[PDB]
């Protein structure tokens, strides 16, 4: 037993990280088959980033201006192209360490592992959720651009996130691996509104089930509620409205604990209206919304 | 910026995990050079674990009774021996993926990454601290025995922990890689007292510095304190006494933020005596003691 924020083992992704240098700037790239993916603002100077014309900036660059290093091995760039906000550098060698992989665009409320990297070298790994407002709350310093987020299904790495920017509020924004930003952000140094965030209700419920599985049961009570009544409470406390799709996803956890989803919603309602009264749940004095129902079942099944 | 509980990249350890089977039981082993390390209770049956005589149990076993599999590749066991609570299986092939490594015995209050494994296959990675009472609060299911904890220094993996047991309280106990348990525990199914735990004061202070570096400053106040006055408060709230050795370790964080350690102790004192008053620090409504001063500087330096 026990329940912790657990990242996927990062080995399959470590073998893909390279450093990408274009004149001045160095960041991280992702080497899969004979293509290296990295953020396109690698072609910018610091001044360029206020109103960069990426098309013109890229026209000034040839294959030989992109220096790509995988540890010590030097890659020979034989093609370059821009897709949305990513650069794709064709190299003449397929990465011998390429895992089975897919590119996926994840939904808000889903989680993934981030392998934070600097100069192409892995630094650490941690779990993140895509916030309802399409930001993530990560740990990224200067030089971390091009670090990627991923999930692993059996042997297949599904890459979902590439890191591009820190907003002045301190939260992080990035793209899928086709270079499309999550949310309304653009790769320009302007102030950008991250919209209203909300708490991921179905994840808080999955986490309450995780807590019951691991012995924390004090929040279980005598009450029940209805989808509509609960959604009134969710609205007041800025939680995502709960839907029948959410109820269905929580079915296995309902089945394994024998606690009906709506009875668990009644517990969450009480916690929202009265707080925790100084107690803790799975080591936290806040309601945790960064575990998906799948995250709970995976960690509670092995 | 941002600050998260960050594990080391697990790739160098993934290449070392094997499964070890001895008659009935299967668990994880660690393959380094031509030796595989695993918990000795792999030689037990379920009934054996109440009062196991490991010496006699091991005498019944020959090299060929230990089946060792590294993914699909079968290892040929050419020797076996017991060192304290670990088995060392000599195999005829050096692990080609052996990283540079050391075996270390860590001190309480130090942190490390755990690569949780089942049947020799990696499941996830997360940070743990060795509690003052030599337990760890992990996430381990049946079959996770032999999973290891480690730190990585540049290219060198320092292995510090091998997982052996879950206590009836739900916390976890294990050995160093010489097979010596941390704390008073033994590899028998008896009830065992984990002594009084305490909060790791120097880690809470390092985490408060991490918070200031990343914008959370509301707990900073007008007050100061002394080592002795603060230690009166630590005693009342079951915190480790603070020493000058701790003050010195916090020197770089003091220097980078310009907040004297004793002024930060004055903030911690106020938090302990009054609580947080519903506010949060780095996303937490509790005082966090699982980041060492080195963990803060590493994550805040790259
Ligand atoms: O946000 C960044 C880069 N970034 N990402 N995570 C960070 C954590 C700490 C500090 C900086 C961090 N920006 C701003 C921008 C606006 C639109 S996209 C990115 C950034 C700043 C400078 C460059 C640059 C490229 N060449 N020279 C400088 C790139 C991105
Ligand atoms: O605690 C364990 C094994 N273990 N470790 N983490 C666990 C998380 C969930 C469930 C079990 C877990 N024990 C008890 C014991 C007491 C002294 S050392 C270990 C355990 C139980 C059974 C065996 C066994 C060996 N052969 N057959 C059964 C081994 C350890």
UniProtKB/Swiss-Prot annotation, chains A, B:
Signal peptide segment: none
Superkingdom classification of source: Viruses
Entry's localization field: Host cytoplasm; Host Golgi apparatus; Host nucleus
Catalysed reaction, written as an equation: TSAVLQ-|-SGFRK-NH2 and SGVTFQ-|-GKFKK the two peptides corresponding to the two self-cleavage sites of the SARS 3C-like proteinase are the two most reactive peptide substrates. The enzyme exhibits a strong preference for substrates containing Gln at P1 position and Leu at P2 position
Cross-link (Glycyl lysine isopeptide (Lys-Gly) (interchain with G-Cter in ubiquitin)): 5, 90
Record topological domains on the Cytoplasmic side: 1-302
Every Peptidase C30 domain range: 1-302
Residues annotated as the enzyme's active site: 41, 145
Activation/inhibition comment: Inhibited by pyridone-containing alpha-ketoamides compounds 13a and 13b. In turn, alpha-ketoamide 13b (tert-butyl (1-((S)-1-(((S)-4-(benzylamino)-3,4-dioxo-1-((S)-2-oxopyrrolidin-3-yl)butan-2-yl)amino)-3-cyclopropyl-1-oxopropan-2-yl)-2-oxo-1,2-dihydropyridin-3-yl)carbamate) inhibits SARS-CoV-2 replication in human lung cells. Inhibited ex vivo by michael acceptor inhibitor N3. Inhibited ex vivo by compound 11a and 11b.
Subunit description: 3CL-PRO exists as monomer and homodimer. Only the homodimer shows catalytic activity. Interacts with host FBXO22; this interaction promotes the proteasomal degradation of nsp5.
Function: Cleaves the C-terminus of replicase polyprotein at 11 sites. Recognizes substrates containing the core sequence [ILMVF]-Q-|-[SGACN]. Cleaves and inactivates human TRMT1, preventing tRNA guanine(26)-dimethylation of tRNAs. May cleave human NLRP1 in lung epithelial cells, thereby activating the NLRP1 inflammasome pathway. May cleave human GSDMD, triggering alternative GSDME-mediated epithelial cell death upon activation of the NLRP1 inflammasome, which may enhance the release interleukins 1B, 6, 16 and 18. Also able to bind an ADP-ribose-1''-phosphate (ADRP).
Name of protein: 3C-like proteinase nsp5
Organism: Severe acute respiratory syndrome coronavirus 2 (2019-nCoV)
């Amino acid at each position: 037993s026990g329940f912790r924020k657990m990242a996927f083992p990062s080995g399959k992704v470590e073998g893909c990280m390279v450093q990408v240098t274009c004149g001045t700037t160095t960041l991280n790239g992702l080497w899969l088959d004979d293509v290296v993916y990295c953020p396109r603002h690698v072609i910018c100077t610091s001044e360029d980033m206020l109103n960069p014309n990426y098309e013109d900036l890229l026209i000034r660059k040839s294959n030989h201006n992109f220096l790509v290093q995988a540890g010590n091995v030097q890659l020979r760039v034989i093609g370059h192209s821009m897709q949305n906000c990513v650069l794709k550098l064709k190299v003449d060698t397929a990465n011998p360490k390429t895992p089975k992989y897919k590119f996926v665009r994840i939904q808000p409320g889903q989680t993934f592992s981030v392998l934070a990297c600097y100069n192409g070298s892995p630094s650490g790994v941690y779990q993140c959720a895509m916030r309802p407002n399409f930001t993530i709350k990560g740990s990224f310093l200067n030089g971390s651009c091009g670090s990627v987020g991923f999930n692993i299904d059996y042997d297949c790495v599904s890459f979902c996130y590439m890191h591009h920017m820190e907003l002045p509020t301190g939260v992080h924004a990035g793209t899928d691996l086709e270079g499309n930003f999550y949310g309304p952000f653009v790769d320009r140094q302007t102030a950008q509104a991250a919209g209203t965030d909300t708490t991921i209700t179905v994840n808080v419920l999955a986490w309450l089930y995780a807590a019951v599985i691991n012995g924390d049961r004090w929040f279980l009570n005598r009450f029940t509620t209805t989808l509509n009544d609960f959604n009134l409470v969710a609205m007041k406390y800025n939680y995502e409205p709960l839907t029948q799709d959410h109820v269905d996803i929580l079915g296995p956890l309902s089945a394994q604990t024998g606690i009906a989803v709506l009875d668990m919603c009644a517990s969450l309602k009480e916690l929202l209206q009265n707080g925790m009264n100084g107690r803790t749940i799975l080591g936290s004095a806040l309601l945790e919304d960064e575990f998906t129902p799948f995250d709970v079942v995976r960690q509670c099944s092995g």
